[PDB]
Design a protein around this ligand. Structure first.
Ligand SMILES: [Zn+2]
Ligand SMILES: [Zn+2]
Ligand SMILES: [Zn+2]
Ligand SMILES: [Zn+2]
Ligand SMILES: [Zn+2]
Ligand SMILES: [Zn+2]
Ligand SMILES: [Zn+2]
Ligand SMILES: [Zn+2]
Ligand SMILES: [Zn+2]
Ligand SMILES: [Zn+2]
Ligand SMILES: [Zn+2]
Ligand SMILES: [Zn+2]
Lengths: 155, 155, 154, 155, 157, 155, 155, 154, 155, 155, 154, 156
């Protein structure tokens, strides 16, 4: 069931939205862990700039997911973002540990960012909570631009 | 094994330290996630201040475990921070998914925070890399104070 | 309707303007009630909840100014006078004999909740695109505060 | 009835001074509304300077009126600023919702600002409370200046 | 066939080419508004000068910012953003701005005619485009544009 | 005994003002030791926001007192703020070092705050130096609002 | 002989007040010019700090200055800050030109600062306009500070 | 010319206004060009060159604006409409079919180099010190931007 | 003679420039006052914007002014900026005390800004000290802009 | 005897450490008051510079001060910062109230600074808590710098 | 040894100041070469590496400032004139005739690492705790810097 | 003739001459910069905390200045030299004393060297024939002459 709130968003609409929101949350938490992972372990040409870039990426991700979770609560549900749940519920493929060049990491990121980027863009139009829709549009715009930024550094 | 570098810390010392650094990166990433998890799902007496208090802790955690990972890297290791690795190598017990009182979260928070704070204070006297030890001490100081902040809010 | 190269049609100009004044009104009041509850609370969790509210006010203030200016943009008049608020406000008059933090949170709860429940249907009622956007940013903040308010209630 | 406070302003001075503070709250809140009303709905020569001048004022006014309300609550009284109390108790003539020229708005604004500026200048003499006096002086300094700005821009 | 650059970005091919198209038009209008805003800002005199003169440095920045947002989307959809002097010149729907005029009032009128055009094209653009990401961009812009038109109309005696 | 200055406040007015200033200095200095003393050792409900509130309190007390001292010196006197002088001359009840809960501390602080508050308010009108009257008013307003802040956090 | 203003203030208080405000406007202007004068032409021990100290004074001077003038105008009057009127109506002896030592310049500054300092102090309770009293008071504090600052660098 | 109390000799004014307008025209085109490169590059060194270029754009517009303002102070008309640039710029129409940073660098260099070599000469040609001063600063900027760009070329 | 300095700029250039510097200083100081004078006492159409506008000119002015006096000093001279010297040496025509409208002031200002602006423009070419030429050029660029701004608000 | 905390530093060391943390707490607070007291009653050559410098040491002392105190509390102890306690536990001699010359005050400050400074440099190696040792070195670093600034301004 | 009330042991003072001017000596020589390469590098990855070096320089300069002042604190004299760096620096002269980003990165790596490793063994070799903490902050930055420089090498 | 290639078309003889000048000014500026710190570290006596802080200000300006001269030399296709060996072998400044402590002592020693450097760059400003270079040298000279003035005005 749900936590009670004077917020009168339809009951069925609440359940489905928390549902999407959460999965969106999980995808973003993963994207933030791997952004760091790639960030630490790059090496080679274009290092520093691509290194800094990624830090930027981390923050916005963080902010966007935050909104997701808080919105899921507003509707009377329970936002999820614990290691066990992520590991258990991510669509994303585990990030490589054996890769080392900047281009390697860029390719690995591009891959992952794209799945979430494409997922969330579709979510924008299939979610019946306008607030989420506006939420989802805001994060779609950045993931897209981040997807572009990343791809754009592949040589 | 290790990646080359001009950094001349001894071979044995490097390897040992990479492992300590990494367990510490692993522990800080969970607390980090746990912190947020509690942040979103809290409700009741003293919510707003404790809610924002958690956002401060996170930034410091994040910021510390980042130094960790980078020291491991400087020593020619691979810093490890993906959901699958943390899930797999976490020393912390899964964070309750269905607790709601701020009080409830404070207590569940203290437990895990103490485990990490206690361990790292130990790590400090152990590690034989002056740098990592310095990092750890700065971290230890923050955790000890966070630990106390948490506990000091328990009714 | 005052003149403007703004080419939005008349009917939708007029219909939207009302909804915008209507909404201006609920916030100005909501704005007033927030500060009221701000000055006259005491008891547990005073300072933090007290400082919270100031934050809401500032946010409510800027959202409503966005509504008013759109109403003027579409060619009408934005109404913000005390008089107009007093008698077109759809919110129950705020109680002036309550003092405890909780009492106040509940009184805030109820009213924020009715404005936030109305602006969310509004998003999807107007046919002025820009206006649905304004509302949605406002709704997003409102629903956050409602959540913040109900989350401090014991 | 006054609420308990260790604060030892004489009981009579408390009740007297609270009533003055509220009356000042009342009209400053009224002037806050009037000021936004004028700056949304003006058009004509010197529009843009004047529209932003008024936002300057708005914030100064809401600042002082807070200082009054808090002094009221401090002396054990109850600050009154609900939509109902203002309309019922405002000494300011209602603002005309049928005027659009910058010039008309200035002239409608200079009359309502004068009453307040003059009320608050005299109230400085009248209050027994030193703190309230200082409060009113500070705020009278801003009223006299704004009033002067307002009139200076009339053609 | 597809004169589209490769990206891992789903958006269907048709929605891609049409939105790009759309994005580029808004781009061109916005750069033009930007050029003519500076244009009028430099050359205006008479009553209410410094206020209007500085009012226009504010709009410039926001146009620049939106336009930059419109260009970068196009390039994400895998297009080429076009904003060179030549493209603008024979692409702007905007009537060459008068260089023979000196009063704040006439500059206001001129500005208003052209702001109104851009103002109304981007408002339409919002429901016409099938990229949800672009309609969000356009609404943000449309909102500033609608505020800016009102600001200019308001300083006209 | 006074130090030369071209400042022309009458010999007698100086001496008395000076004595009055140092008293308010003495008791402002104490009040801040006490503000920190409570800051560190409070635990219980509402801990964090109460904790931070006081540090704000501590800053304000510090500028006011600093202003009082410099005025004494301006008049040609010596400002006294050595721990010896506070101890031997503070009219405030030594602060309890056994209490621990936030509530207990807030009560202890209310007592002491109200004393100094109720004194410096009397002082505004007792003092024959216009400048000193002003400092005291600025300071009294802060104390009167802090007392209220303290009292209002009391359950 | 005044300018229409809705600012009701007994017209005769108006006239008296404008004159005092103009006398302080004149004096503060002269002091500001004097201050730069010494600032520039200073040399000897303790140069750079005194020189920097003096810039500080100036910004305060001209700030107090401005409020005096804007108030004169507010009451229906004309603010007088012209080079001719400073020359013709200043009670201050023209600052010397032959001096160059910081010590010489501090003393020229002190004897002049004191004229103005001691003067506006009395002005405070001499004037019938309440806001002018608050103004003069704020400036009197600063003036008394700067004086004391100047005097304390004298060996 | 338009009247101003500004006593710069009439011919000087005419001459200077013209040269100012030539530089206003080139810096604008430069700035358009800078942004075109900005959106449309991909390949090695992207993120950094991308943001590098946003810096020049900012620099370019302040300077160009300083030139327009000077021309107007002298009684002339600052020109920066799309049509005038198109008709008077001496830079080759920028390619819209190129994609590599290394390509875009090469293109920016050609054009940047031209304008840079032309304002450097302008510093000593003009007979108005203020223009010459403002010309010298822009040149200094343009000479740094050209060395940055060239420097980034593999 | 000049104050001794290692600065080796030739002696005749020292004297010649010093005299030229003090000349700009005198003029700029006059402009400054005059600028503040119009800023206080104008009323009419376009008041607020023009009124704030004028405060900017002043900051700009006193900055350039400063740089001149110090250059003078560096070369071993005495910078003069006293009221008396301003009153005696000013090439600028005494400023009208009775004008009241924005246009009245604008025009009086235009006349005097233009006189100064035309002069310093020439001084750029007249003076043999490169440093002091840069100095004048910078001022010149502000002054022509300010004249332009002033003239551009005249109807 | 101690307060309950999950912090598992051993009881014995927890106790020794608190004791040592509090002694510094006491000494810093005292240097704090002393620093402020010299700041006020100083005059003579080099006044403004030294005056300002002391204002910087104060806030420095005050932060280390805080860091020591909470460490104490987070270890289960009570921090002790009360005028009474400073009186009774301070090892620093009373600071003289009869001295007036910057040069006199710098010598009185040096003595006491040097005492605390030399004491805490030893404390680093004595304490068995790494966190406090770190805590001490930072403040030690400041104290030494401050001792050198003080001494350096001596003639 | 200059008089101070700081009571470190005469012996420890003397030793510690000598180890402090050595860290001061190589840190100045490193900041010089840092700009030298900063200025004269070109090729792939120029801009970010140019600016990266600016960050490093600010850091080196602050650390070395710290060693200096400690040394004076113990009663010693700091040593940082051109002639002392030249006569006392361990590191090989930096190569004037190299231009590529890659040549420069490797030229810096070599020198940074020599200083990087010296000060890391210095931490354990000083008797002054205030110097060990000091050296340690430096080491941390220096080790990160060496990692940043090596990590850009293709 | 061994200049790095660039589309910057300043006359080639000018580039070589200007580069030599630019580099000579860089040498002096670094030495000043070195020396400044050296004094700021080792002074003691009356007026120490202000001269000390003052000096840190000088360092900052010198560094931004000398950095402009070098990026200039490099633009015209040269090599900017700033190595301890190059300052050492190529400097016009006398070796700064390491046995002075007094504030007045250090002020006098800086005064002389600041003087040396300040007076060269002022003349440089007229002797160079790349305009950007003189704008550069003029801005610097403005700071040096002011810094020199500050330093002299602190001598008792
Ligand atoms: Zn959050
Ligand atoms: Zn990192
Ligand atoms: Zn508004
Ligand atoms: Zn409030
Ligand atoms: Zn961009
Ligand atoms: Zn103070
Ligand atoms: Zn003013
Ligand atoms: Zn402009
Ligand atoms: Zn100055
Ligand atoms: Zn604290
Ligand atoms: Zn330093
Ligand atoms: Zn550089």
């Amino acid at each position: 069931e749900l936590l009670y709130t004077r917020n009168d968003v339809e009951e069925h609409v609440k359940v489905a939205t928390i549902k999407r929101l959460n999965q969106m949350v999980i995808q973003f938490i993963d994207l933030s862990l791997i952004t760091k992972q790639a960030h630490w372990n790059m090496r080679g040409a274009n290092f520093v700039a691509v290194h800094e870039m990624l830090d930027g990426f981390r923050t916005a991700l963080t902010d966007h997911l935050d909104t997701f979770a808080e919105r899921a609560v507003q509707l009377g549900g329970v936002a999820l973002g614990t290691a066990q749940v992520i590991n258990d519920k991510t669509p994303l493929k585990s990030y490589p540990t054996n890769i080392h060049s900047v281009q390697e990491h860029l390719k690995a990121l591009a891959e992952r960012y794209a799945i979430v980027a494409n997922d969330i863009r579709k979510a924008i139009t299939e979610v019946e909570d306008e607030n989420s829709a506006d939420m989802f549009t805001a994060a779609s715009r950045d993931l897209d631009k981040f997807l572009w930024f990343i791809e754009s550094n592949i040589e």
